[model samples]
Every structure is written in C-alpha cells, then in structure tokens.
Target: IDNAVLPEGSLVLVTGANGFVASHVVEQLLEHGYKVRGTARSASKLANLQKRWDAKYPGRFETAVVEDMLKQGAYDEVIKGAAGVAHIASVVSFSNKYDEVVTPAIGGTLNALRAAAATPSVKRFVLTSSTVSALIPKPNVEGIYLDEKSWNLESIDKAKTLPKSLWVYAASKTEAELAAWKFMDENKPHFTLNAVLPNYTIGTIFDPETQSGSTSGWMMSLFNGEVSPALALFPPTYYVSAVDIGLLHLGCLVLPQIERRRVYGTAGTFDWNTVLATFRKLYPSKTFPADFPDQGQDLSKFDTAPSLEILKSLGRPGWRSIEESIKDLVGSE
Candidate 1:
C-alpha cells in the first residue's frame, strides 16, 4: 500500500475516464488513496461515474469534459495540478481512412503530452498502447519478438495503402505511441513517460449502469448471438484483464523505477472459438455461436516478465486469470 512515489491524496488525471479500460484505471487510483480527476467526451458520460465514485470515496473523485481532442490545448485545463497523468484515451473509430483515424489519435496524444509537460507538478505519465500498435498478431505464428523496442512499421506502411481497414486503427495507435515518445525525447519534459500495451481488454466495469465497456461489450454481443464482421474473423491473440491493465497503469505512474518503458498486459490466448467453448461451459443451456473454420490459436511468444515485476511491486500476483476475467465480463453481460 505504500510504494507510491506520489503521496496519498495526490490528484492524478486519467483521460478517457469512462472508457472500458480507463474506468478501471480511475477506480484503481481511487482505491489506492489518490484523488482522481477523470475526463470524458461529454458530461453525460460522466454522470454515473461521478455518482458512483462520489458515493464511495466522497470528495476524492472529480470529472471533466473534453469536447474536442484535436486541439493542442484540449488537455491543458483538465491536467492542471495533477501529480500524475494516464493518457488512456485514444480514438477507437475503426475508420478506413488515414486522416480520419491517425490525425485525431496522434493529435490527442500530443496534446496530452504537451499539457503534462506544461504542468511542473506532473512527475509521471503513461500512455495506453496496444499489442496491435506494436505487432499484428498472426494466429499460430510463434516466437515473434514483442517488446519495448517493437514498433508496428508494417501497419504504418499498410495504413498508407490498402482499403485502409483496421490497419488504420493500428497505425493510429502506433503513431500515437511514437509521437508520445518523440515529444518526451525532444521536449525533455519534467515528467517521465511509460506505456501499457494491452491486448483484448476484458474485465469489470465500474459504471455498468451508464457504461458500455466497449471491448467487453463486444464479448457480450457474441453471447447475444451477434458479432461484428471485424471481430467475427479476428485472428487469435492475447487477452489481458482490464483489472491488470489498470493496475499496470498505476505502477507506471507511482513506481519511480519504471521509466520510459512499455509493459504488455498480455495474459492469455484468446479467440472467438475458444471463447465459445468457455461460454458453453459456463452456461450450457444458453445457445452460442458455433466455431469458425480454421480458427487457430495465437501461439505468439512474448515476454510478460516486465509486467509481472511491476505487478509484484504493486503487491498483486503475476496476472489475473483469463477465465476469471471472462467470468467478470460474462456476468456483466
């Protein structure tokens, strides 16, 4: 309970606060005795978040509405006085156009970096990156090197051409991570920077009353006998718990030894076929979708040791069970 570099009651800002993963981050920060300031696109999204945290932690929770992310000063006011910052918000618009996806994502990240740099009190900042941002998961492809030095140059190249597709989204995240590090390197900001590159995030939702928990919501969509075309054929990859992602963000913020690092929150292998089996085993009476043809497992090798170290420092075990996380989301369904 005492590994915090930032003292207890320190105000830490979390961007995209009401999001599936970001909400877990906000809640974890609050649980660890830090005062949390969270931002969403609109106040309506923050309504349940406000009431939920206020009732639990009282005056320790706060909210802000960031109407536009493209503006360079968008995060300035909200980041004021924050001792730490978690830039967990990124555009998830699965747009096929480069300008539509990469521009806003990169701009939003740069704006947050600029604001955190402007604030002298901000000692640490962490970016929520993705596994796709570093490496495109190829099902059954083993021994791909995924680490801090990794970059999805392939997506950046494909994002230039092709029907664009989700390569656009991958490129967006890739550019955002690259842009964030470039800002820190060039500006020599007061705060140190780190990143958490999460795989498919699935876990608890803090404000289930008003929140969709987008990714986990996708999981529920499967249970409801419907699936998006993109997800219906998505390649098998890792599944990282939302709870672990949030705690890793906390470790990046409060643990001083971790600087200029990227920890992969990749816990277990996942694919819709395997997920179907789990769902069937969990709720045998309910009908679920049949497995897709040639749905192979993701045997991609990655080093999860760094994240494990941070989790240990934070006093949690290596990583939460993927089954437990699925149970959390399934019940949430």
Candidate 2:
C-alpha cells in the first residue's frame, strides 16, 4: 500500500503519551506544528504533560484516557480523524506470568492495529519496537551487522529458563513486534506500518514531575551514589537519544518509501566507563564515585544509514552526540 503524505497541520494520535519516550515524540510532533491527541492510562497522571504542552503549544496538544489498551476498540475513538498513530505503549514487567507481561505486550499492539485499521483517516501507523526484537546471538563475535531482517532467534521457552528478567523482556518485545508484522500483513490496513527499533535511549526528561524510568534514570542514580558501580559492568552499551527516537517516529509517519520497514535508531556504542568519562569531563568540580572503569568495549555493527537518510531527507538534525545527550539529561534533571 502507498503511504499517504502527512501534512504539517494534521492531527496525530500518540499512545502512552505520558511515557518517557512517547512524551518526547509528542513534543516533537507539536513543535513541528502537528496537532496531537495523546493517550494516557490515567488522565490525572498526565496532568503535568497536559499543562506543559497546553501552555506552550495551546490547542496543539491534548490527552485522552485509554486506561485499558487491550479492551475492545480501545483506540477507535481516540484515533478518529488522526493523520497517523504512534503506538508506543506496551507492558514492561519483571513478572513471569504470561498475562502480566507477554500477553499485554502482544495483545495491546494488535488491538492498536485493529483500532487504527478501523479508522479510515489514519494513513500511517508507527510501532515503537526495540533492539531486543532484533538481537541475533553469535558466539565469540566482536560485532555483527543487524538490520530489519534480523530477528532474535532466542526461544521464549528458553527465555523462561533464563535467570534474569532481561531475556523475558527481550522475548516479549520480539514476540510482540513479530505479531504486529503478522497483523499488518494479514489485515493489510490502508495505512503504512513502520517500526522504529531503538537501542538504549538516553535524553532529558520532558516532564520533571513524571519520572521517565529510562536507563538514563538509572545512570543518574549511579552518579548519585544510590547504586553500586558494579551495575556498570555491562559492556558494549548501545544507545540512541530520546530526541532521535522521537524524530524517528516522525520519520516513520512521513518518510516516503519506508513502509513495512524497521528503522534502527542507534546513535553509537559505548560502555559505562565512557559514560563516567563524559560525566567527569562535563562536571569536573562534582565528586563522582571512584570505582569507574577506565575502558569500555565497543560492539556496534549496526546499519543505521537508513535512519540517517530519513532524517536528512526530512531536514532534521543529525543524531545528538552521547556527550550532548548526557549533558542535556543531567542539566535537565
């Protein structure tokens, strides 16, 4: 199906608007002169988001309650008359129960698709997937190129046996995204379906009143001495900025010829030691924990040219440097 041209003044429906990453997506949409009808599980929780955007971009943004995305036709009403939809909400949990985490992740996405398909006006549908969905494991490999074709072959049954919750999270994302693609193919909605698979995203919080629960928040706690530096032992930290992901969502909505594609929204690869080094350079006077690694392994072999091309074509700024992202995050907090 041909992707429709999303005009600047059209309205876009953004699900999970109160989320850390989704809020940035909504902000960018509004800044670029697009009207937004954002969805939140609870309207009260989104009061800060509503107040901030309503004041700055009056009449350009508003929030609607979709407390249960898995409910029948949850997004049908909210999606009416919107030019595009950014489906950003999905269940993220440490629970092993299928319903608690996995089902919602998959079911909510399918429901979002069904609702969007019912709304004839929605011409573009962007799914916020993760790199977890595309992780391909290879033994003893320093780095390997990953693209849209890559799928994390790790079995959900095996993930169930894994000790950490990370595997299960990966499984959930992988299953949910695959289900989304299946839904798109079988249903063949009029709108173009594009997914943005971003790595660990770091960026300034859009609303200070609402905690982002992003990895950047954990890094902040590490700097604050609330967590042990041993948490930084994870190597080859691949990351992208929230702002870049936000723009990537916009690109998926408006960029031509990118239908049914996965855009890798990775900035670069770094490790905890590099994060500490950047922090030390930026805040020389502030006392930081002494237990910091001196070096970090770089395991980044991602084909991000497509994402860059989209951003360039849209006249958007290039990916923000890690240093810049960190500084902005710290300053904003």
Candidate 3:
C-alpha cells in the first residue's frame, strides 16, 4: 500500500498499545513508515512490546502511560504534534455494573476526541469500534441487511433493565460510538472522525506468553481439543481477520475518499459447518468431534464494498478467508 496520504515519517498516537487488537494497529502503522506513540496503563507492562517493535523498527515506536481515563486532561499532552490518532483503548468487560463498563467506554472516547481536537497537527482520527455498536438488542430477521447507517437502538434502553452481561457490553459499545458520532457532528473538529467496525476477529496472536484471550481464543480451543462440542455449540457469525481490521484503520487514516464513515471489516459469513469443514481440510490427521450438529443460523447481511474499496485503493489485497485466518492461528502456535 502507498503511504501518500499522510506525510512521510509522521507521528501517530495509538491508545491501548498492550491490547490484543491495538498491538496489530501499532505494527501496521510502523510498517507503513509512521512513528507511533502508544498509550498503556503502565509502561512496565509494555517492555515486551517495546523490545519486540523497537528493535525491529528502531525508534519508530514509543510508549506513554495514561493510567486514568477519567482524568481531566488525560490525553491532552500525549496527542500533541501528532499527524493522527487511533483510539483503540477501551474496557470490554462482562461485568453487570453500569459504571465499571459503560462510563469508561463513553468517557474515554470523548476524552480522546477533546484532546485530539486541541492538537493542531492531527488531521485524521480513527476509532476502533465493534459491530456490537451497530447490531444488538434486535432480533436478526432473515434477509435483513446492515450497513454503516445501522445503529443499535434497543441496547441502550434494554441495558438498563436486562441482567445479561453480554447486553451490558453491547450497550457500552453502542453508546460510546454514538457519542463519538454525536461529538463529531456537533464540534466538527479540524480532524476527520471515522470508525472501523469489525466483527468476530480471528488471526495471529501478537504475543503468546502474556496473551490472555481474544476473539480467536474460542476458535483455537477447537484445534487444541480444549472443547469437545465446540463444533455445533458456537453460533454462525461474520468474521474479519485482525490484520484486515488494522488495514481498515490505515484506510481511515490515509484514504481521503472515505470520511465520517464506519468501515465494516467483515470478510465473510460463516457457520459451524463451514468452520468444521475448513478445520478438517486443514488438519486431516487431527481428531475432531464426529457428532457435530447443524445448529447455527446466518441471518444478517453486511455491505463490505466500502471497506473493500478502501483496501483496493491502497493496493492491498482484500480480506483473508476464514480458512486462511484459522491456518494463521494454528501456524502461529
């Protein structure tokens, strides 16, 4: 891909550098000739990331600690004089408590936005969002198509009364992204506000020793024989590789054509049957459950042409296949 949109060797701030998804964002930025300033809760935790990327990229990456998301001027100093900002840091928790999850999601987004607006050097700002913000609290009706315009309307109200922990996570993302869009519309900061909404992400783990869990952990369980009935128990879902999600962020930062848009990083749709078949094809010697039932459903349609166009314009290949994504996971192990 070409690095013509932003200046050569520009500095970009990526929040939550220690996170599974954000780590990839940092790598892609450095590979594309950009210097990165990544934020973490504490700099000590980033020693591994620093040693890995700094040695390879050579002073291209640096880390800063922003321990408190609710601080009055949390990111105000970190974002100064940067060409762009990728706010990938946010709490994704299963807790039922409202403040524990919801407040940080909303507050952190606004804090980043406000801080970035003050930085005159920033021209582009990308938010790492999830499809949960767009689809949730509504029954998936057959033949229904969802795109960037779709917003999760029911989650906010339902979150107040629903006891399910998943709904709380859904509401947190939904409200936070909405608040960002609202802030963009009202403030109209000098920099453009865009989001990359990814579905179930599956691909390589950046670092395995300190790795805890990610979207790919469940799929890896099937390969390691950790779950016996993993074949049929999981639901049919759309997925995008973590690398492609990083590319979507690159597109939002560099591509001038896409502005104020939610780039859908949906590679394709898949069911348990498809996943099982791919696994069998990839690893013929491995033993998998034989009684894998056909229990998953595919109900929603996604428009990924915009995201595809962004990648195509940058001279990058389209999203990786689910099979290839799985292969990368197993190969990384």
Count of backbone clashes, every candidate in sequence? 0, 0, 0
Model 3 score (lDDT): 0.80
TM-scores of the candidates in the order shown: 0.93, 0.92, 0.91
Which ten-residue region of model 3 has the weakest summed lDDT? 226-235
- What are the per-residue Cα lDDT tens digits for candidate 2 across 1-333? 124278878999999999888988998888778899999889987898899898889999988999988899787679889989999988676676744778888998899999888888989999999887877333235757787788876746657775546667778889999999999889788889999998878888767667646766777876665656557434465778888888888888887866788999788877676777777888888777664544545564777877887777667667889988888778622
Candidate 2 wrong stretches, greater than 4 Å = 1-4, 98-100, 136-140, 155-157, 229-235, 291-298
Per-residue lDDT tens digits for candidate 3, residues 1-333, read: 454567879899999988777888888888888899999989886878888997889989999999987688998779878999999988665556766778888988999999988888999999988887877412345866788888877677778886555567778998899999999989989999889988888777767655446777667776666654534333566888878777788888888787889888778877656766777888888876553556546578777877998888867678788888877777621
TM-score of 3: 0.91
Q: CA lDDT of each candidate?
A: 0.84, 0.80, 0.80
User: Which candidate leads the pack in TM-score?
Assistant: 1
* Candidate 2, position 285, lDDT: 80
Ranking by TM-score: 1, 2, 3
